A paper describes a structure:
The viral type II topoisomerase encoded by the African swine fever virus (ASFV) is critical for viral replication and infection, thus representing an attractive target for antiviral drug development. Type II topoisomerases can relax supercoiled DNA by a concerted strand-passage mechanism in which the enzyme first cleaves one DNA duplex (G-segment) and then guides the second DNA duplex (T-segment) to pass through the transient breaks. ASFV P1192R contains two conserved domains, namely, an N-terminal ATPase domain and a central DNA cleavage core followed by a coiled-coil arm, but lacks the nonconserved C-terminal domain (CTD) with modulating activities reported in human topo II. Similar to previously reported topo II structures of yeast and human, P1192R assembles into a large homodimer mediated by two interfaces.
Interestingly, 3D classification revealed two distinct classes with almost even particle populations, generating high-resolution reconstructions with C2 symmetry imposed at an overall resolution of 3.16 Å and 3.13 Å, respectively. One state has a closed conformation in the C-terminal dimer interface, and the other one appears open. In our study, two distinct P1192R dimeric states were observed simultaneously in the cryo-EM samples, with their DNA-gate closed, whereas their C-gate is closed and open, respectively. It shows that the conformations of the DNA cleave core for the two P1192R dimers are nearly identical, with a root-mean-square deviation (RMSD) value of 1.25 Å for all Cα. However, the coiled-coil arm of the closed state rotates inward by ~15° relative to that of the open state, thus leading to an enclosed C-gate interface stabilized via extensive intermolecular hydrogen bond and ionic interactions. Compared with the yeast topo II, P1192R contains an additional pair of E817-R1046 salt bridge, which is retained in the closed state while disrupted in the open state. Since no DNA substrates are present in the cryo-EM samples, we consider that the C-gate could adopt both closed and open conformations prior to reaction, and its status might be self-regulated through inter-domain interactions. In our study, we observed that the P1192R simultaneously exists in two states in solution, with its C-gate closed or open, providing the first experimental evidence to support the previously proposed model. The N-terminal ATPase domain comprising amino acids 1–414 was invisible in both states, probably owing to its flexible connection with the other part of P1192R. Besides the ATPase domain, the cryo-EM densities corresponding to the region covering residues 471–501 also could not be traced in these two states.
Residue numbers in the entry:
A (entry chain B), B (entry chain A): 415 to 470, 502 to 1192
Write the structure that this text describes.
Amino acid sequence: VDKYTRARNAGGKRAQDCMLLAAEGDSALSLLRTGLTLGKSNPSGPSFDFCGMISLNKVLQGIVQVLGLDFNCHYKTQEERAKLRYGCIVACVDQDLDGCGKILGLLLAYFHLFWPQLIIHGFVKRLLTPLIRVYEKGKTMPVEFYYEQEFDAWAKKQTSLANHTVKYYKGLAAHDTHEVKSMFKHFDNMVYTFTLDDSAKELFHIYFGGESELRKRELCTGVVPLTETQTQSIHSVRRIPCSLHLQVDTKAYKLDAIERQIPNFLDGMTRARRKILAGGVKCFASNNRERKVFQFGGYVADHMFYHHGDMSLNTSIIKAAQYYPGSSHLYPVFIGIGSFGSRHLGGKDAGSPRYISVQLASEFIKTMFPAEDSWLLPYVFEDGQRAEPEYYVPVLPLAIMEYGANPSEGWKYTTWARQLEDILALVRAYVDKDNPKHELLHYAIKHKITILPLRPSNYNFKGHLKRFGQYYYSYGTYVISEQRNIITITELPLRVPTVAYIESIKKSSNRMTFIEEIIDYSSSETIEILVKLKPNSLNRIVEEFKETEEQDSIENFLRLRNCLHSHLNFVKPKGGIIEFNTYYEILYAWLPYRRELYQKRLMREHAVLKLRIIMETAIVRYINESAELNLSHYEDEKEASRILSEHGFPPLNHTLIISPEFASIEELNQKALQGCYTYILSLQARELLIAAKTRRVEKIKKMQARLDKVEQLLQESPFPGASVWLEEIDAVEKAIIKGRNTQWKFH
Amino acid sequence: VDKYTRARNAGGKRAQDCMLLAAEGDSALSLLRTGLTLGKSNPSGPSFDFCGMISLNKVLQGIVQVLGLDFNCHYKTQEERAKLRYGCIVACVDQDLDGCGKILGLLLAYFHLFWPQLIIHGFVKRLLTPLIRVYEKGKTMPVEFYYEQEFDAWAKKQTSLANHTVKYYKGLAAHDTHEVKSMFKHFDNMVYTFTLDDSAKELFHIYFGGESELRKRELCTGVVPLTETQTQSIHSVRRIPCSLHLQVDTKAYKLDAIERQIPNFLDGMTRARRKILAGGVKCFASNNRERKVFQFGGYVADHMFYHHGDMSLNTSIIKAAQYYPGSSHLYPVFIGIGSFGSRHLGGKDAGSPRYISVQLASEFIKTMFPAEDSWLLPYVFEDGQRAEPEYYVPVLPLAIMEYGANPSEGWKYTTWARQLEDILALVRAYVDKDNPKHELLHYAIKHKITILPLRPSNYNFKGHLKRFGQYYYSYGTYVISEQRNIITITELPLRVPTVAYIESIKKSSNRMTFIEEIIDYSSSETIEILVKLKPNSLNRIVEEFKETEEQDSIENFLRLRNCLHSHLNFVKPKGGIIEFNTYYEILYAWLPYRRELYQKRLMREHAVLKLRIIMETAIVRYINESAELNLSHYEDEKEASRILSEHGFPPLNHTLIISPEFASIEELNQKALQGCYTYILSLQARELLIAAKTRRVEKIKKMQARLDKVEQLLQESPFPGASVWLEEIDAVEKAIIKGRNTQWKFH
């Protein structure tokens, strides 16, 4: 067997004392080799005298061959087990979702399917490695945690983490050489044994069986973290229940795989698209200069922790910067500068990422996603670093205002964008206090009924939308020239590529008996396809493809019909998969999430406003009293701070009060008043002038007026921030109108 | 033909008036479609009434089929040409090296090989597009340049470029929609015609023929830019000579392809490795925190314009961060944190980029590549943005101090690292004024002779190096255990992977007749391979593989011999390929480049030192006179600057004097004294204290002493900066020793 290293006693008298270390890949094999050949010191550590290696179907067949297993045996007796060359198999896979959730889960499912008795009595093991290590400055022995719950619980009891650094080891390749030495020093303590319980059989049949309905039922709930009692139990007994592993790690892997293709219902974007939007907001905030697609993709991968390859990242950026009839985004995030694709090839004809550049639609992004509300969203922490937020809460329900189509592993996601006017009317009726049927909409939301209609978006569509039964249909347009005996196709159904449509028409021989030649003469936006028919066939086409009520004979001939199928599957904010029936439900579910955000916005802005008022008042007082103070007479920082303290100047946190980027209201109240005199001692010479003093006084008056206005808005009815919500809705509508007027190029 | 659109009159009465637009790809096809269907305005513009499209072997066969060409025809008469369906073929390729240098060159070579008369009388055309566009703030009509020489010449005559923005269009996908409209408005003016001259046949046979020696001769010189007279001629006559295109664009493409695999002799790194090193220096300058491989690759692609895929970038970063016996880098740039690879698989067993992290070797990089010398190197400008420098000039000849092996398109590059001690001795003898045979080394350099020897690096090699004839050989080590009848391999030849060696031994049946089993029991660094022989074969092995003077019988048996072949092919600083014979020549060629850099360093530091002395003197004067000035009494910035001017304070450029990042000596002398009073008006309140004043006075005294020392160093013999060079050599040696002592992990 290739990439297999045997031991001295494998298959010998003490073969039962041997071990087989199943490595995930080449890096795992290198780590195992480094650990095993380490036996020049600490002789108690493992070596090749009893431990072999193997790399992880042909792979499972090889593992069976090295293990000397028999497919016709059940291994219910010790004598039957004695024929095995190795006493146990240990899987050395990484702690990430792809390694321990997929490969280890597949190995466990295979062993349970073929030899359950080996798992029951104990034959399959895994090598737990320290997931998180905390290093103390000056201390040589780190604090090692095997689960994130342990690290979190330990951190809650720590006074301060300033002198502590946290390193996450989710992969076997992330362990340094000295850490590998330390791990293989205690190797005998870090290997656990799998145990099969009663619920484990059912859990295995749910995750790895052919029963898709049970899998969909199981994936409807988020990941359940291991309880502290369970963590203590597994650490004490040195045994992993198979059911617990399947319920935690495999479920997390499956939910992460599904989450990549199915977006949240609050913002209508997946994790990758959320990362891209956050990176675009961060990059183009200072200056909205054009940046190339590969450069911006590198920036996103650097800042928002986008570990996937550059191909998918560049494709997603291009798709987010695309704007053409039938595109996925009716309101794309980025302004495309160059050739980003055409409707004929479905956007796949975009230019190379090295040539096309991307620019952020500042007027649309700054209004739809307010910058002041970005500090209140829950953020995703990747290895201790703050990545993109868990979900965006835009001013309007972006999940239903844009086209979407993404298949999944069993699930289907397909949405057709609703009309902007109807959504705006519904949201305004919900928000506006004095507006017809405003209380009626509240009653409708309370009793889950619909009053105002939602219609599919007819923009960028030179056709007519018709409803029949409970489904929507989009029709194309055609003209007939009897003189030349041709049919000119002027518009295709919604989201139908021109090249794909032509190929589908050509691939049908029956239609080809009547069609002589098809030429694509369409523009970039306008469709013009000339179909030449054979002599004396138009009457035959009408006779064969009989005209029906649903579609005309020509429409049946040319496949000028589309079905607006809608599968409203989305991801809940706290994990899991949620299924909606109508877009009304998505709107009514998204409304409270945004309604609750304005109150937090207003309270945080009130507290921060008080803090800025205090600081600017103190600064203006120092500006007025600088001549009396004569700060240059004092020697160092300590004496200056002391004399500033004698004059009653309050000590404030300069860094946090000015920039409370992610501080809560309680944090602001408890910490912002425990700083130093930097706010005075760091004032520049140009700020001592009368012009700067007058500007600061005017700013203080404006902040006081804004504080009073914030109090009034907090006292507003029905909910705080209703008028602010209406103003933001109007701004978003104006930005969308300006974008649509200028081909989504704000010039 | 797939992806082909015909015209109305193609093959008709006016078929000679038709055109065939050969597009490079899907983006070129989209641009051509947008331009052709644009004919709703400006009817003089081209349309589908006379212009068709086609996408660019099967491709050439398709082009021939649409053109209706005959392989048995020469097309020497107009009547023969009249049978053609299209009057001419126009290649729509991008202006970059890969598009117009490779695809267009290949098409021209094909047409010249098969139908030269079509090129001679005129049948192959190309579509020139504006490469560079300059936009004036407030002006609607940009200034379009088709070559970089035109833009450079226009820029030399401009007073200031602050109000001008420069956009480079090297790809067809980089043209915006309005720019595409403007281009197709003048389409009839922007299409040129290819002409075949006498030297064009020879140039075609050199570039596309089978004569590799002529290609190597041609690639020995850098790219020759088009002369201004030639540019005016081609713009006036609307004709591109084939010889000029081959000599410029194809030569540039070939030189860029070769340059990617062959490094410069001044620093021993290719363009990608130079970009990676510059990005690492820029990223880890502020803080040397660990960063993941994919994150750092994204940062490099964002900052240093690394347009290649993330796979190659991550592989190169991993290779630059690798450290193991037989690795490419004896002194790797980055400190590898994790599993970056082992000698058994040649470094291909590295972990995933998502898990392993990279850290910059600050102590080695800051000493080998001085930060003060990074401002004087010539930099590469990518689309107007300053990318990595053209070449690095380290303290020591890094090109010959590290292993290297990179094949090329006809060329071979393979270097074996020389001993550090011998190189240090030679460089010190060159630099040190009072050192034995110092003048002797100068005479040797003058007359191109060798005095002190260079030997291959024996570090990290548990074997003996022997020289026979003019070649070097590396021998492995083995032991024989007659009791067990086995041979234990303890060390492999230089740069020989363990797995590859084992597979090569196994693949030889003759050696396998004597070998029963081979097991790999080697450590991460130490090799231990046990080879079991069949009974009574050791004497047979000795008898068959006869012992010779060069290698022992066992060494011939196990292939424990390597040949230290050296191909010293490098890239000149100003383009081209240079071939050396011995490492002595590389050292003697690299020495003057570094010798000349110290003088520029010293002069620039002298001028900058004078400027800092002036600014700090003025600042200290203002600190002393602040109480008298009473700056708070004046209203705005203008009045404060005026009163500061009355007191005789000099106006200096605060931004440039403090940070002259890329200003030459003449620029420093001419511009640094034409600023404002920001250096005084931006002083913080904490800087007015007596402690800050004392610190500034001490800094002024230190700067005066350093200015005197810089004058003394400029007056040094034999060349300025000799003592500084010796100090930097000692620092580099100490850093290398510290790295080698700590496994290249500076802890």
